[PDB]
């Protein structure tokens, strides 16, 4: 009858976008608004939730305005999905509806005491003691730890639970809270898998863990799926509520990294998405039973397309300096200028010729988690130019990743089928060819730029009937939104000798205080 | 009454220089002639002995001609001295006087196999097996090894030997051959030392080793002192006998690193010379009685003034790179553009932030004899930059010097008086600054640049009465030279710090193969 449109709120660390998709999953309108990165102490990071909510209302308000001008058939939105930076926690109150403090951000560290004050004590020295319930280790990321701090370092939050009005929520929950007026106080499985209070298997809260780490089982929202009806957009803030002419529902909510997988069409095990930037998140779809890991990797919910639908779980890995290495090799090293001499230089040489550049500048994340590791280059000769090191950096991004892949294989019990890539170096043709061969699978690269925001846009489409099933979601993406593939092109006397080289080069990374 | 003059042929690796000196020990005429550096295969290097010879002659002409223009007083030269690249070995013929084939240089590596058969079949295990006669390990550099490679690889060599016509010698004996026309077939202590067929203390052709590696006695030149009669320039090539208005004697012959030792006023033990250009060697005056070493350090002659003079021995200790590291960082790495920016950027930062460069590009030389070692960098952070590297680079140099000095200080029996510098990077404040620091001594940077050439003239000038004694030669030099010095800076707070890095840094260098 009409042309359908699904909106998505991409809620990043630094910026929040609002993106409107028409039913061929085209991005037809975008508006981006950044927000202040308050850093009260070296190691601390927080944001203003009422700033974010505002930014979001700006993007929504503007993206809708812009589209309304260039598309004569756009006349409302079927549903809105939310995707968000994970692990960021907000404190607030049912009856004021304001927030009670600035939200400590995922990588924010004010909680490293409570990290230890939980391992040495409540863990008998084992951070993994709960790795079977939560699918997580103890660390400075998950919403439980950041709640502990607000309860023990802010009276305004300490007082508000004394009351029994205090509300916690990762950004999603918070965003749907204000967007609906205060009505829905709700969350999804992917975000919930990161709170440290949740139960990998059953995807219900952990009264056991809520207990121990002492967060009342009712300062918390409810755990819903990824794709259902969460609520309705009833908030007049900025233009937004007006700009939507009928009561527009929220029908999709999903942690961004999981949204990146889901938006990359990874609905089946083997498939994996990898987002680059300064650093990476490689998430592999692992199937219908939560898989656990020995390499201290993360277990988490990939997605759930409906209140009690087939719940696909996932493993997760990170490296910390990917595009940041490609940045350092410029901003700090003179080795090149434009992102185009870089890939001309690296191709100017056939191989690396015996050298290994381990960009372990913060140490090794990935599968080796070794803080004693440092940036280290071995086996240089006089024959070593700058144009080799730069290729050996492209190898390093691929090689490190391979370890994470390797790891996942061992802890999944299946082979990486293919890999999708986005938001890091999708222009860098060479990296994908050095990457594709090594892993031994097809590396797929999307032409369309907004997979992450499509992730949540597809959770809200489905649930509203913009696309019928996940099987029809593949075909639309198969026909409209192009990919070109990058296919393997190397052999063992390269593929397996490089993996040997890397590891021989790894014993030489150590370099602590 | 008119000014007394003396010549020194300074036949290097890349080029032949001829320099005329007056009694104020000042260079008054100079001429440079380069010669082709043939690399017939990878890791080979040879020169035409005739090219070299003709260059020596074209150098004498111009230097004899320029001198007239400049100071018309000039009628003749008192004596000639010769200084040369050591270990390069020339095959020639006592009849035809032509070279039978080319000449493998000191850094040429065609003598690998031979070395192995030598420490195998003849040596029987230890590379130090003849080191109580030759004062040297069994390796590629030394001249017997190159001698035999020629006996059993060139058709014209052994065939000219079957007739007994064959003649051998390093450049100094070779140049002193065609200068006379054949008349003289001599060599001095410093070059003979380097051959591996001479006893270190008795300066005779090692009767055992002679027949052991097979090199017939007469194929070997008479062994003289550094400072005496040798032959007469009875050659007519580019009219040297002609241009030398009178009959000119040869009263100086000495290897170039010892001549640059002797040209820097290091007549008493504990004083050391550090030279640049192709390579970098430290040589410290050990004393009148030879001090043998256990570390891979070369015991060698320092100098012998006349038949019946005191022979100070010394210890060597090679290091390939100096301005080589800098050229790599510049050329290969594009880390900067001009050698102006090296010291700039390196000074332009406080320190190395816990990195260490190891510019062991073609192995690790010095007292740590390790060929598997390659160029490495350890300890990098996202805050490390292109200048922290350039800083680290120049610190790896002196730290390496340190250990060779520590090897001597040990095996020699004394500490360190003073050390002087010459070559491409002697004009480098920071370099001698760190070296002054690390070693704990004064470092004199000398105004008269070309002091290697001085050495041989000094052997020609003492022998010919132009100068009377070294202490007088010290006083003469004093009446012309300016001490641009650098002294130590720091305690254990700074010294044992970057060293501590150094030790463990090095412990991560073994890579090759
Ligand atoms: O001529 P150089 O400056 O390359 O020095 C080479 C050494 O004398 C070889 O022992």
């Amino acid at each position: 009858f009409t042309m359908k449109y699904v909106g998505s709120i991409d809620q990043g660390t630094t910026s929040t976008r609002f993106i409107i998709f028409d039913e061929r999953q085209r991005p037809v309108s975008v508006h981006q608004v950044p927000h202040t990165q308050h850093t009260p102490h070296p190691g601390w990071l927080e944001h203003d939730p009422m700033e974010i909510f505002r930014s979001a209302c700006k993007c929504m308000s503007v993206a809708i305005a812009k589209l309304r001008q260039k598309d004569a058939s756009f006349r409302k939105i079927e549903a809105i999905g939310i995707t968000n930076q994970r692990e960021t926690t907000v404190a607030w109150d049912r009856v004021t509806k304001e927030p009670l403090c600035y939200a400590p951000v995922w990588n924010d560290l004010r909680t490293y005491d409570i990290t230890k004050k939980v391992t040495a004590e409540l863990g008998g020295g084992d951070s993994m003691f709960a790795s079977k319930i939560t699918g997580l280790p103890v660390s400075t990321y998950f919403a439980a730890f950041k709640m502990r701090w607000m309860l023990e370092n802010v009276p305004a939050v300490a007082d508000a639970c004394r009351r029994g009005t205090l509300c916690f929520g990762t950004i999603d929950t918070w965003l749907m809270y204000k967007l609906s007026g205060g009505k829905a106080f709700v969350t999804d499985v992917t975000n919930a898998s990161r709170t440290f209070l949740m139960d990998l298997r059953t995807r219900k809260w952990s009264p056991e863990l809520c207990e121990k780490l002492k967060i009342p089982m009712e300062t918390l929202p409810e755990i819903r799926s990824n794709s259902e009806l969460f609520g309705y957009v009833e908030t007049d803030e900025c233009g937004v509520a007006a700009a939507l002419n009928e009561r527009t529902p929220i029908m999709g909510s999903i942690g961004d990294q999981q949204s990146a997988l889901f938006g990359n069409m990874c609905f089946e095990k083997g498939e994996a998405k990898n987002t680059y930037g300064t650093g990476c998140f490689l998430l592999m779809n692992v199937g219908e039973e939560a898989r656990f890991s020995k390499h201290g990797l993360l277990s988490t919910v990939g997605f759930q397309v409906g209140r009690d639908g087939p719940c696909y779980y996932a493993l997760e890995g990170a490296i910390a300096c990917a595009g940041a290495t490609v940045e350092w090799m410029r901003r700090n090293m003179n080795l090149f200028s434009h992102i185009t001499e870089c890939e001309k230089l690296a191709r100017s040489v056939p191989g690396t010729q015996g050298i290994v550049f381990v960009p372990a500048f913060s140490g090794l994340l990935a599968p080796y988690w070794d803080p004693s590791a440092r940036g280290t280059i071995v086996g240089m000769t006089l024959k070593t130019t700058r144009a080799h090191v730069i290729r050996a950096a492209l190898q390093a991004i691929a090689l490190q990743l391979n370890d994470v892949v390797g790891s996942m294989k061992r802890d999944a019990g299946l082979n990486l089928s293919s890999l999708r890539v986005d938001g890091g170096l999708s222009k860098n043709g060479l990296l994908m060819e050095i990457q594709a061969s090594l892993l031994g699978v097809d590396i797929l690269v999307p032409s369309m730029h907004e997979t992450t925001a499509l992730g949540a846009a597809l959770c809200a489409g489905l649930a509203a009937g913009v696309w019928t099933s996940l099987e029809e979601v593949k075909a639309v993406s198969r026909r409209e939104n192009s990919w070109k593939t990058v296919s393997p092109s190397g052999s063992a006397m390269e593929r397996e000798a490089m993996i040997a080289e890397w590891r021989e080069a790894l014993k030489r990374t150590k370099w602590a205080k």
Side-chain angles (χ1 to χ4, degrees), chain A:
Chain A
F1 48 101
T2 46
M3 290 311 298
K4 303 269 171 62
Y5 297 93
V6 76
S8 173
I9 291 170
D10 193 358
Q11 220 298 313
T13 300
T14 72
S15 59
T16 307
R17 329 175 84 204
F18 186 69
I19 307 188
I20 311 180
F21 297 88
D22 65 14
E23 45 196 300
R24 291 171 293 169
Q25 307 158 204
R26 311 254 145 164
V28 289
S29 212
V30 77
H31 195 242
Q32 170 147 164
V33 169
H35 46 276
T36 289
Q37 301 295 326
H38 303 114
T39 54
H41 269 282
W44 299 36
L45 183 59
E46 69 207 35
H47 303 140
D48 171 22
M50 299 291 302
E51 162 151 56
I52 281 161
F53 172 52
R54 301 198 178 103
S55 295
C57 290
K58 195 88 283 139
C59 306
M60 276 172 78
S61 172
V62 172
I64 290 171
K66 292 210 293 213
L67 221 206
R68 206 158 267 171
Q69 311 302 119
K70 71 183 173 283
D71 185 284
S73 24
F74 169 66
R75 67 176 280 259
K76 77 148 190 165
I77 325 187
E78 290 299 291
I80 288 166
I82 292 142
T83 187
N84 52 284
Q85 51 168 301
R86 316 178 304 194
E87 289 147 12
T88 310
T89 324
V90 201
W92 74 96
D93 178 294
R94 343 192 160 175
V95 309
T96 105
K97 309 199 177 299
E98 295 278 300
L100 273 21
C101 51
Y102 285 165
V105 181
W106 61 289
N107 49 156
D108 161 291
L109 305 166
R110 77 193 66 191
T111 62
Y112 174 57
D113 276 315
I114 306 157
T115 300
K116 277 292 151 204
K117 212 220 80 183
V118 161
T119 58
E121 278 143 35
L122 254 142
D126 194 28
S127 74
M128 288 284 288
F129 88 114
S131 69
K132 299 283 181 191
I133 276 139
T134 60
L136 312 160
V138 176
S139 51
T140 44
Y141 299 85
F142 313 110
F145 307 91
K146 306 195 202 306
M147 286 159 187
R148 197 101 291 273
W149 192 98
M150 294 183 277
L151 257 158
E152 298 170 341
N153 305 77
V154 199
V157 170
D159 292 355
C161 183
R162 228 88 63 37
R163 269 169 278 176
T165 44
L166 189 67
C167 287
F168 291 136
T170 60
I171 277 288
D172 68 299
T173 291
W174 163 253
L175 247 40
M176 303 188 277
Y177 170 77
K178 287 317 291 145
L179 253 33
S180 75
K183 276 146 167 54
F185 183 37
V186 298
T187 202
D188 61 79
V189 280
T190 64
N191 292 280
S193 69
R194 329 291 292 177
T195 53
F196 209 76
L197 307 174
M198 204 207 72
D199 201 87
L200 257 208
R201 301 160 313 220
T202 59
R203 291 151 271 112
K204 312 274 100 162
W205 293 122
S206 172
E208 195 183 346
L209 269 171
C210 293
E211 217 299 337
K212 299 186 173 217
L213 308 146
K214 280 292 156 61
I215 288 89
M217 259 231 56
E218 18 95 1
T219 59
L220 292 159
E222 157 194 13
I223 303 161
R224 292 170 127 173
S225 90
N226 279 341
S227 181
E228 81 214 25
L229 162 67
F230 294 90
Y232 283 92
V233 186
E234 291 167 45
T235 180
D236 64 325
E237 246 266 42
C238 305
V240 58
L244 311 137
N245 265 174
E246 286 137 44
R247 265 220 329 173
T248 301
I250 312 170
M251 298 184 95
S253 186
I254 181 161
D256 51 10
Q257 297 325 303
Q258 282 100 320
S259 182
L261 186 72
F262 192 89
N264 272 345
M265 301 295 154
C266 313
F267 321 127
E268 325 225 290
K269 62 181 171 188
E271 288 152 316
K273 128 267 128 64
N274 166 225
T275 309
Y276 327 39
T278 294
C280 97
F281 277 109
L282 189 129
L283 279 67
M284 176 204 275
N285 192 346
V286 303
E288 283 186 298
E289 198 148 271
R291 256 61 266 252
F292 294 84
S293 194
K294 307 274 153 288
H295 319 293
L297 289 200
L298 302 207
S299 296
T300 187
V301 180
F303 68 91
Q304 193 181 221
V305 208
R307 188 143 212 88
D308 320 277
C311 194
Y312 284 76
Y313 285 101
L315 291 169
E316 187 163 310
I319 75 90
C321 304
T325 318
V326 195
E327 280 302 328
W328 182 88
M329 285 194 299
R330 169 196 145 271
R331 187 92 148 85
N332 305 37
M333 280 294 278
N334 192 41
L335 319 178
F336 65 93
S337 175
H338 196 107
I339 206 155
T340 194
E341 185 194 31
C342 170
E343 218 176 314
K344 217 66 78 209
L345 284 171
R347 318 195 94 109
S348 327
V349 302
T352 64
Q353 320 222 29
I355 70 160
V356 184
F357 178 9
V358 195
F361 298 121
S362 307
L364 260 348
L365 287 105
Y368 283 108
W369 274 293
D370 179 343
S372 152
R374 292 294 120 180
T376 170
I377 293 168
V378 262
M380 288 181 298
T381 58
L382 284 181
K383 214 71 237 151
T384 307
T385 65
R386 63 148 187 204
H388 298 104
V389 175
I390 301 172
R391 197 179 169 104
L394 291 216
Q395 294 214 357
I397 312 146
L399 274 158
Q400 295 186 97
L401 213 271
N402 168 71
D403 289 305
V404 159
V405 181
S407 278
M408 278 164 180
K409 305 197 302 191
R410 292 179 272 251
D411 293 314
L414 54 90
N415 254 280
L416 188 90
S417 314
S418 72
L419 183 79
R420 292 99 224 279
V421 308
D422 79 70
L425 283 156
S426 61
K427 275 200 166 180
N428 205 298
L430 182 50
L431 183 54
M432 311 297 102
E433 255 179 320
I434 301 175
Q435 222 161 68
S437 299
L438 227 203
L439 305 174
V441 307
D442 250 31
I443 279 198
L444 283 96
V445 193
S447 50
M448 199 270 281
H449 26 306
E450 346 282 26
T451 71
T452 271
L454 175 63
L458 294 162
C459 290
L462 287 160
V466 171
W467 304 278
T468 69
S469 75
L470 290 142
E471 162 74 286
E472 194 200 354
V473 167
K474 277 215 211 90
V476 170
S477 184
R478 191 210 144 191
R479 218 174 297 104
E480 330 287 347
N481 286 291
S482 150
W483 328 70
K484 193 171 68 63
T485 65
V486 188
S487 315
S489 86
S491 59
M493 60 93 177
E494 297 172 335
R495 171 154 49 232
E496 194 62 50
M498 198 179 302
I499 297 186
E501 209 164 60
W502 176 245
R503 315 286 255 268
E504 306 292 336
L506 285 191
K507 319 196 189 311
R508 298 137 158 115
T509 59
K510 271 193 167 108
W511 199 257
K513 292 96 135 280

